[PDB]
Design a protein around this nucleic acid. Structure first.
Lengths: 138, 214, 214, 138, 138
RNA sequence: CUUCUUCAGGUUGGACAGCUGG
RNA sequence: ACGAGAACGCAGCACCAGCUGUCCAACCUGAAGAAGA
């Protein structure tokens, strides 16, 4: 619980509202390139990150321990490394990660090191993608 | 009765079947080839080989031209590759399979990896400035032993079906298999084309082998 | 069908098609040539030959002016070399292939390596200092047998297409193929040009072979 | 499971943070050439090294043996030789190698002779690529 | 699968560690061109031998056999002759070949008459070039 | 009798994206 | 000596058929193996 997103925290009763707010703020004044924008992110630009998050979620959901094991924390660290990778690979993903704080949530999970923290992060990510679609998509 | 079409696909030039480019680690080549997830072996997907063979065979069988949807092909094409029409559902007699390369040991004998990196650039014509890029290709000389299952449904047209299959293999040898084919890539060859009976024996299997070998 | 345009590329001067400095033996030349990964033979990439021929033909079909995109070339250029236009995608009639070195036996029996190491330097005019430079080039007299596949999309516009092909081949004669052609490297000479039918036989093929050999 | 760097240590979980701090140190104090010129390393400069690492990673990962084979170790030693060659060719590449610990990590992989140490080395090089492209890129 | 620098030469390791040690010893005390002189080796004085070795490697890598053919043996004899010529030309290449046991490697490769022996010799040559450029160069 | 063993510049762009049938 | 006793919501059914991860693109640009007196 109490997952820090940098500015304001989220919990089991909050993640959907903040995910929707972040996605709506994505559509309001979207990303601008060097050549004046004006595209948004697509699913097949963070699909690898989403697949890694899904794999780690499957691994965690099959464990009843309240504390994440080091073998799973390695997976979350690799998730953060990859997020840094595609963030620098293209700026359309960098601002998407910055404004919808994937990195802050990953760091908070890697600090709390608890099963519930990662479950809340996964729920927040799922809500983020769900609101990204039905408003944008692709 | 069911038949198995053995053979090998030899890369005359480098081949590039487009990969996922989202799960091949970090810091890999710009455009990777498709590989087996477990063994990391480059493979020729059965879908891609089937699609290229079907396109070439349908174009050559009909008139030399082909503009229709895949479901509106000739009877031979539909009976070999299947059809999903409303009242005309042909069950495909050919079952293609993913083809991993087998001669990794042979390639490792020459101290070369299965895949290379090809450096290309595009020169902007109004500026005369080059734009380098890198792609990954399975090196020439790689061999891909494949297996295609043939459903022997009608005894009266197995000879014609295998004539069409040999013709499609021949057409693939004068074209490419996936990737930047017009730009020097994807040229393949077929040899050791032999058909065997999956279970039991086929009394016309010697005629099938000689039309599949010539 | 699949008319095959065959021939041989002969190096009148040394040729340097730029390969990666990496992926080779440590301590080699600073600027090496592209090679086949397995056989280590010098290679003429099909993409490089296609790009040079398309640049030369589009320039000659546009009265020596090329400031446009490749997709905005002439109709004959677009039909021979393909197009990715949104309005209409033209499948390339010409299928280039990577060209391996072929006369290695004669280079062996003449006691010459496939590649020669060129010795170059740049001297300033303000100061009499010459910076040494090491460049690798495929030796002259190296043969390169190639095979360009041609598609008979239309039978009426085949003589014009082959005349364009011959014009492009002859434009490469008065030009270089790859690399440092400004400084005398990369001169090529097409020879033994011919066209054959891949499958079956094609009428009036003698006309195409006549306008292609000379 | 644990590769040495000297004073500091890298394990299966902190590889990303150490790669990030190593990259940040490089960007904060970029290498200065002989003629007072600051230079940034390019992915193409170490592309051959990275492909050599990935080439032997594919054959290591297809091996369920704790101890690395003789030919795999030959390939890894050749990788270290190539790293030294590329460092000697370009002073900026040598500076990148020294600020990071490619040489130290690769020689510790040679020392441990085990499959997991090389996998963690590959994780470290992947994280270094990711954080290098995150800040400066090519 | 093994030649004699004087101690040992294994494919797995020490084909580059002995290059380490040879180059470190050369830098430990560089050659003395004359009593009242100071000298340092330049990689431009090894280039002919490197070209010959690379050509022979290209010729032999495309062979499905263990023993090198007669023409390859004549090429190795040429390699030794060129070693002697370019060593006698500038007597610092003499020091370089003596301290690296490079002529001894040539003789061992000739004696073994095996493809892998020449492959390991070429690997050691690459290691020598790499580690000379690393520590020294120019 | 002389030193430089390479220096400088580009480092991916555009397009398609699920449609039919039960 | 319970509006109760006994009673499988059970049997047969392939989430399946058709579909190329494809198209366009030169690893390119400039450089005296050269000079004291």
């Amino acid at each position: 619980t109490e997952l820090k997103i940098g500015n304001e925290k989220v919990n089991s009763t909050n993640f959907g509202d903040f995910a929707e707010k972040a996605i709506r703020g994505i559509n309001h004044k979207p990303f601008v390139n060097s050549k004046g924008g004006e595209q948004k992110i697509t699913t097949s630009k963070i699909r690898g990150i989403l697949e890694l998050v899904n794999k780690v979620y499957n691994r965690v959901i099959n464990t009843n321990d309240v504390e994440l094991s080091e073998n799973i924390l390695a997976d979350i660290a690799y998730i953060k490394v990859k997020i840094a990778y595609e963030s620098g690979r293209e700026p359309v993903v960098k601002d998407f990660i910055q404004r919808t704080a994937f990195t802050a949530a990953i760091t908070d999970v890697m600090n709390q090191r608890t099963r519930e923290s990662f479950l809340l992060f996964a729920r927040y990510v799922e809500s983020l993608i769900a609101y990204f679609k039905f408003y944008g998509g692709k | 009765m069911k038949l198995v079409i053995e053979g090998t696909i030899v890369l005359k030039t480098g081949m590039h079947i487009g990969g996922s480019s989202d799960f091949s680690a970090i810091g890999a080549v710009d455009s990777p080839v498709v590989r087996d997830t477990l063994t990391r072996l480059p493979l020729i997907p059965g879908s891609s080989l089937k699609g290229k063979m079907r396109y070439l065979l349908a174009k050559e069988l009909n008139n030399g031209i082909l503009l229709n949807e895949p479901n509106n092909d000739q009877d031979e094409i539909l009976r070999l590759f299947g059809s999903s029409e409303k009242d005309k559902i042909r069950r495909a007699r050919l079952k293609f399979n993913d083809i991993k390369l087998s001669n990794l040991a042979e390639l490792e004998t020459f101290n070369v990896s299965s895949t290379e990196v090809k450096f290309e650039n595009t020169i902007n014509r109004k500026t005369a400035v080059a734009n380098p890029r890198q792609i990954e290709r399975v090196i020439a000389g790689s061999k891909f032993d494949f297996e295609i299952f043939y459903n022997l449904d009608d005894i009266k047209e197995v000879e014609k079906d295998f004539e069409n299959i040999k013709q499609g293999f021949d057409l693939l040898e004068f074209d490419y298999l996936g990737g930047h084919g017009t730009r020097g890539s994807g040229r393949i060859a077929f040899e050791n084309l032999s058909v065997i009976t999956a279970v039991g024996n086929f009394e016309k299997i010697n005629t099938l082998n000689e039309i599949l070998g010539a």
